[PDB]
Scaffold this active site. Sequence first.
Site, short mmCIF file in Angstrom:
data_model
loop_
_atom_site.label_atom_id
_atom_site.label_comp_id
_atom_site.label_asym_id
_atom_site.label_seq_id
_atom_site.Cartn_x
_atom_site.Cartn_y
_atom_site.Cartn_z
N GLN A 1 -3.19 -2.19 12.68
CA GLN A 1 -2.74 -1.64 11.39
C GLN A 1 -3.78 -1.52 10.30
O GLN A 1 -3.54 -0.83 9.32
CB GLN A 1 -1.56 -2.44 10.88
CG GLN A 1 -0.43 -2.41 11.84
CD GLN A 1 -0.32 -3.77 12.46
OE1 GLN A 1 -1.12 -4.21 13.39
NE2 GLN A 1 0.56 -4.52 11.86
N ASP B 1 -9.22 -10.68 9.19
CA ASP B 1 -7.85 -10.36 9.61
C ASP B 1 -7.69 -9.01 10.30
O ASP B 1 -6.74 -8.27 10.05
CB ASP B 1 -6.93 -10.38 8.38
CG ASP B 1 -5.49 -10.18 8.79
OD1 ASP B 1 -5.12 -10.75 9.86
OD2 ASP B 1 -4.77 -9.43 8.10
N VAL C 1 0.84 -1.20 0.00
CA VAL C 1 0.00 0.00 0.00
C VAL C 1 0.85 1.22 0.00
O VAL C 1 1.77 1.33 0.80
CB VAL C 1 -0.96 0.04 1.20
CG1 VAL C 1 -1.88 1.27 1.11
CG2 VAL C 1 -1.76 -1.27 1.29
C1 LIG Z 1 -1.99 0.56 4.96
C2 LIG Z 1 -3.35 0.68 5.62
C3 LIG Z 1 -3.83 -0.66 6.18
O1 LIG Z 1 -3.66 -1.54 5.11
N1 LIG Z 1 -4.30 1.18 4.58
C4 LIG Z 1 -4.58 2.52 4.50
N2 LIG Z 1 -3.82 3.37 5.24
C5 LIG Z 1 -4.09 4.64 5.22
N3 LIG Z 1 -3.33 5.49 5.87
C6 LIG Z 1 -2.32 5.34 6.67
C7 LIG Z 1 -1.87 4.12 7.11
C8 LIG Z 1 -0.85 4.06 8.03
C9 LIG Z 1 -0.29 5.24 8.57
S1 LIG Z 1 0.92 5.14 9.84
N4 LIG Z 1 1.57 3.70 9.95
O2 LIG Z 1 1.93 6.28 9.77
O3 LIG Z 1 0.15 5.44 11.08
C10 LIG Z 1 -0.73 6.45 8.13
C11 LIG Z 1 -1.75 6.54 7.19
N5 LIG Z 1 -5.09 5.11 4.46
C12 LIG Z 1 -5.90 4.35 3.68
C13 LIG Z 1 -5.63 2.99 3.69
BR1 LIG Z 1 -6.56 1.64 2.68
#
Ligand SMILES: C[C@H](CO)Nc1nc(Nc2ccc(S(N)(=O)=O)cc2)ncc1Br
EC number: 2.7.11.22
Length: 275
Positions: A122, A118, A18
């Site tokens: 995260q 799942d 992603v």
């Molecule tokens: C990767 C995550 C879960 O698969 N998918 C998404 N994540 C986000 N944003 C995101 C994910 C993780 C982080 S982190 N790891 O910095 O908090 C920040 C923004 N947005 C839409 C989707 Br679909």
Amino acid sequence: MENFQKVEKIGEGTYGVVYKARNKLTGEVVALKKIPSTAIREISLLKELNHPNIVKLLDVIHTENKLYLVFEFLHQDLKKFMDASALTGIPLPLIKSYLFQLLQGLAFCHSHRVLHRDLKPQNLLINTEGAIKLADFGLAVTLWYRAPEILLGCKYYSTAVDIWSLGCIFAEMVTRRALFPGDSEIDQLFRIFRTLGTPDEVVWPGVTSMPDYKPSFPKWARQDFSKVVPPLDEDGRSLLSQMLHYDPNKRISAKAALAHPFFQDVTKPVPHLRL
Ligand SMILES: C[C@H](CO)Nc1nc(Nc2ccc(S(N)(=O)=O)cc2)ncc1Br
């Protein structure tokens, strides 16, 4: 898929990878997931599945053996937020808000017969306005959230699996430590047994005839639930135990959990996010 400028990699499972990405022509910032006729039709159905607590699937792109899903972008995941809040703890009212919204998301998907299978921190995504949303479902190395019936080889598991995982997430938000952090399938199952007690025919009719059930399993006594999540109040604890019932049939539905007394004073705080 030349329509998108990759900004950074933000995730990966074995499903796919992603990226946060920008549409070159519209300027929209999206999450782009880079992943069979059956799957195309199935994901087409999931595109219609709109709810405030489900990450919106905006577009599906099938281009030469490769498949991209275009999702709305949220700004932080619950793991990073739990880590950032780890010295202080997430305030109870925000824990309760998030658990409540997640249950609305589950009830909605569940009413449509769609499972996550799942769930984990995260896959739970937050924004600055106090929303929390579920990412990656209907799409079906962390075992920590896995329901006991999956681990026991059940082939036809139910929407109850997502209640179990969400229960383990609730406990983790409260205690600021993972409830069942197994490092193998059997370790995962045995950590479950050592806290909740080894299941048997009295609490889970049919358990001993499940495919990977072994009569040789050690017989641990169930622990005191107040030792599992201090300092959840007794309402939260009752709700947690109903979410972590062994028997998938006894385990509370998302819809029933929404009515639990725990949510009588639910509100929607906003978190303090550092982006
Ligand atoms: C990767 C995550 C879960 O698969 N998918 C998404 N994540 C986000 N944003 C995101 C994910 C993780 C982080 S982190 N790891 O910095 O908090 C920040 C923004 N947005 C839409 C989707 Br679909």
